Design a protein around this ligand. Structure first.
Ligand SMILES: CCCCCCCCCCCC(=O)O
Lengths: 171, 171, 171, 171
């Protein structure tokens, strides 16, 4: 009865993230998950994927002036999960309505016309099962695509198509 | 007391807009303009363009349950401006820091891989001068790309590449 | 839609209400909730709170000439919701812009220098969730104070501070 | 930190409850609901019903030596529900055959020559649906009276006839 029976996650340190200055918290257990895509280039090795997480945060903090990278977690095609703001901190990925009540996970890449590789799909689903196991998400949490709550094409046609079949998907 | 022009704006009732539920006001003169794209299909006839203004508002209100189409104005490839929420109503186009202090205009189409036709651009430039002439915009207003204030590809590489050249543009 | 309903509400007859003469319907689902106070005497027991309901309806019907008590629901410090005009009928609580597009709930008493007990707040928020569940309110409904849409102290300095913190609150 | 639980439950600490020491968990969702009376005093205000819940729980804890008040929830004549051991903790209210399979709720007074007011019955029905809504209760649950499962005069003569008229009430 391991108190934390879930998940390999690449932590901030390891992907060389800038220290976060977000303080605003979510309230566990969290009800909604919104799946996005970064919409840039993908990345398929740990060194490449850790670079990409760095660039993303670089955009949100350097350019856009945010307190941290927007997403709670990002999903690489190396098939690891990168800690974004994580389970406890409100992200900025889906507007002032969905942000304080969800967890935004973003796949790194562009899935308009490309599907994530199986290992990235498993990483993402294992990550959700682990949120439930941890009490961070509700046992009956709901998955939305980004496009379901914000006017956008994110998470891309081929990914949208996939998340829709998921156990917890609810539009 | 001088008012001139200046709308060749196509008014909501003409493009068969559903009636807006929004009540929140911008305060004039408005300092900022944010230029997005719909990421959508483009339209080059006053008939398709009216029909697209519908489909775009239909997305925001029916799908997303918003009070109205998120943009203050939209821009067809027909060379006409489409009235959205207009000059005095807060729009929902660039998040909660920029929505209340800006006008958002969006070009109907996806401009990652096309430039909008020059008449589309003349329409947008003439809008903005109208706004100044009305006292809706500050004479020295500033223009931003959507991707400059929010994480997105909007308004498209090509379109973005154009707006960087505008006199009122600002880093 | 559904056999019986959600949440508990003291019915019109139970608080000895005069029959309604109102017929203007609201349009489901409603986007706005406006929270007032009555600035009248407060009460903390089902007996005294029913009495108070009556006195308010009475002032509205007999002195103001309204078809019924202006509020859709009233709220007692006894922790009970009193049925006003209900989910379906247009109230008179927020003036002619807001009355046709909102549900008006009023806490019975004056909340400038005191707060309503946790039980009143709970009942209020409860009511509201039931509104959504019935499909009388939008799921993305927005709460406003009376002072946000009309110039008035209502709902009273201390209660306004409170509703500011509600999830659905948009000034 | 979000909107309160459905049901408008007066939380433990609001009725000045001694802390629970119970830890046997009920496995959701529960099939049976058992209705009892307390046979103690009865109370018609929030003040007097807080106190009465105190007194019942005191009797259970200090005198009988139980981990907490025996009932999952108590119901006041003030029209409120008082959180006992709640949705997730096995109670002690109907003996060892009935406690591990059910949620016990009890009305606070003697219902032999009296009935609880309509508000008290409203609270309870409301509690039970909020049960389902949470996922604590079977969508398709069965309600049983105390005298049906254990030799007793509980829930009184009058209360007991009433609940037999409830829909969910089983033979
Ligand atoms: C999910 C069934 C109906 C939900 C209606 C809203 C009442 C709240 C129940 C959800 C539980 C919670 O918010 O903790």
């Amino acid at each position: 009865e391991d108190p934390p029976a879930c998940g390999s996650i690449v932590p901030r340190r390891e992907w060389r993230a800038l220290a976060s200055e977000c303080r605003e918290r979510l309230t566990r257990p969290v009800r909604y998950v919104v799946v996005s895509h970064t919409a840039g280039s993908h990345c398929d090795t740990p060194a490449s994927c850790a670079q990409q997480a760095q660039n993303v945060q670089s955009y949100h903090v350097r350019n856009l002036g945010w307190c941290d990278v927007g997403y709670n977690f990002l999903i690489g095609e190396d098939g690891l999960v990168y800690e974004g703001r994580g389970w406890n901190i409100k992200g900025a990925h889906a507007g002032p309505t969905w942000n304080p009540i969800s967890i935004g996970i973003s796949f790194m890449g562009n899935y308009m016309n490309r599907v994530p590789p199986p290992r990235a799909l498993r990483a993402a689903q294992n990550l959700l099962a682990c949120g439930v196991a941890l009490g961070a998400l509700r046992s009956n949490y709901e998955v939305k695509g980004h496009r379901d709550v914000q006017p956008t094409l994110s998470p891309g046609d081929r990914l949208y198509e996939i998340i829709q079949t998921w156990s917890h998907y609810r539009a």
